[PDB]
Amino acid sequence: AIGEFMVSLPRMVYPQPKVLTPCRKDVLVVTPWLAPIVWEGTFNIDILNEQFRLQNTTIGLTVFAIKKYVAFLKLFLETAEKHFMVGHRVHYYVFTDQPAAVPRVTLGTGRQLSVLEVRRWQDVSMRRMEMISFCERRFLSEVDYLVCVDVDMEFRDHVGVEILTPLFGTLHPGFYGSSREAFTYERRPQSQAYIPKDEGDFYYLGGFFGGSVQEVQRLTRACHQAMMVDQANGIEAVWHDESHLNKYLLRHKPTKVLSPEYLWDQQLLGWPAVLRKLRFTAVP
């Protein structure tokens, strides 16, 4: 559940937060609209696990595995079992054109997997946003939060309830140090995804976003509608649904932002000092 009567935390023994000692001095840990930016060292996972377990939180994880991308599911799911929301209730939703190619992955207790079969490049571009906004009633009934990720990835370290919030995006690992003018937003005013050179907070990834079911459905519905307008006007945004996600999150600020720990490519970008953990990474 979300927002329900919250029982008292038990007694806990942990290090005292010190007001005149930052957790991290090397990075921005809060946005200018007072959303936490989630980095290692900023959260006590024991406190957060208590809070979310006391709400009996259920997390849905959506992933699309189409055509040859079904080959990525085994490592994706095996590593999710090791690292993603361990101890919490998890429902995986695997959207695929090949239900029989989904690997039989052994799940921990309190975790389940559903295989959802799905059916022009234009409809392929819009499929993720459309499908998340077909699954509307199901997600509302089954999970509290939705996390929407790409399949050609593996978990390497903890990804847990520290990410959960009404609406989150993830800082793209290519652009977290860039000035806004260099962001690869859609720049043509004819597109619904258009962002001028003097606007923008961050460049968020299409491959890792989420929130409450309600907020995720609002985002995916808005992006799908904007993509349909663009299609009608004969324009395709430079980075497809990621361009629309960026426009949405500019105008509807996320309530947490995940640091690039949460989606990194070690082959392309190495392992910078500022990343204490690489939690979820591109498969080479």
Side-chain angles (χ1 to χ4, degrees), residues 1-3 5-103 105-118 120-130 132-133 135-136 138-284:
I2 298 173
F5 177 72
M6 181 69 176
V7 73
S8 292
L9 289 166
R11 151 181 173 88
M12 301 175 66
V13 174
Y14 52 78
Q16 185 197 344
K18 297 296 204 83
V19 166
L20 307 177
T21 302
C23 288
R24 294 290 297 261
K25 297 194 244 68
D26 51 336
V27 295
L28 188 65
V29 305
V30 73
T31 71
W33 59 92
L34 298 175
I37 310 179
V38 184
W39 298 93
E40 182 65 10
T42 63
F43 58 93
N44 181 317
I45 196 58
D46 299 319
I47 299 173
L48 296 172
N49 278 329
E50 282 280 349
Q51 293 184 125
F52 283 90
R53 279 303 302 145
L54 287 168
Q55 293 279 137
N56 201 26
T57 302
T58 303
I59 307 93
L61 183 61
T62 68
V63 68
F64 289 72
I66 306 296
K67 295 194 288 187
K68 294 175 185 148
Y69 282 77
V70 296
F72 293 110
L73 283 163
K74 193 167 173 294
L75 186 68
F76 177 88
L77 296 167
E78 282 167 351
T79 64
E81 283 298 304
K82 293 178 172 287
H83 298 295
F84 181 76
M85 304 290 169
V86 175
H88 299 273
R89 293 190 64 177
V90 171
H91 197 145
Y92 301 99
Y93 301 95
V94 174
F95 293 92
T96 185
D97 61 342
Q98 299 156 79
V102 179
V105 174
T106 309
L107 309 182
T109 193
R111 310 173 70 99
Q112 65 181 297
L113 187 147
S114 298
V115 176
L116 299 321
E117 191 170 6
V118 301
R120 301 171 66 257
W121 72 264
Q122 293 112 125
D123 293 322
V124 170
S125 189
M126 295 189 296
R127 172 198 276 138
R128 181 237 300 290
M129 297 299 183
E130 177 196 40
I132 296 163
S133 58
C135 295
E136 190 161 20
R138 182 155 178 179
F139 294 148
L140 286 169
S141 311
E142 292 190 334
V143 304
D144 297 307
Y145 295 91
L146 279 171
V147 179
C148 306
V149 303
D150 286 350
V151 73
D152 54 329
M153 301 288 165
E154 61 176 318
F155 294 87
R156 299 195 203 183
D157 209 329
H158 171 96
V159 175
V161 297
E162 72 281 357
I163 75 179
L164 301 175
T165 192
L167 181 63
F168 71 85
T170 304
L171 296 175
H172 192 295
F175 300 101
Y176 67 94
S178 304
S179 305
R180 53 156 70 114
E181 58 265 32
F183 291 162
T184 58
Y185 293 148
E186 173 56 56
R187 301 304 191 171
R188 292 167 292 169
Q190 295 75 27
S191 172
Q192 297 311 291
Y194 171 57
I195 300 169
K197 288 279 186 176
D198 57 358
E199 295 178 56
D201 304 305
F202 304 109
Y203 195 76
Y204 305 102
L205 280 148
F208 198 154
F209 63 91
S212 68
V213 176
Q214 179 170 46
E215 291 301 309
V216 172
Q217 288 170 346
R218 283 166 171 167
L219 179 154
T220 59
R221 182 184 309 120
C223 290
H224 180 214
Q225 289 186 195
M227 288 175 83
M228 289 188 298
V229 173
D230 273 10
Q231 187 165 335
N233 296 154
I235 187 164
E236 174 66 17
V238 62
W239 290 110
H240 318 297
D241 67 0
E242 176 171 278
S243 302
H244 296 276
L245 178 136
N246 275 280
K247 179 64 169 283
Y248 187 87
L249 293 176
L250 174 62
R251 302 295 205 230
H252 310 260
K253 305 299 192 200
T255 54
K256 296 183 177 168
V257 175
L258 309 185
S259 72
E261 300 168 356
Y262 289 84
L263 201 162
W264 194 255
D265 183 333
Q266 191 181 11
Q267 169 187 35
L268 217 55
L269 297 160
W271 192 336
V274 76
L275 300 184
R276 299 186 180 178
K277 299 183 165 207
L278 299 189
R279 304 168 186 279
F280 183 65
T281 61
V283 172

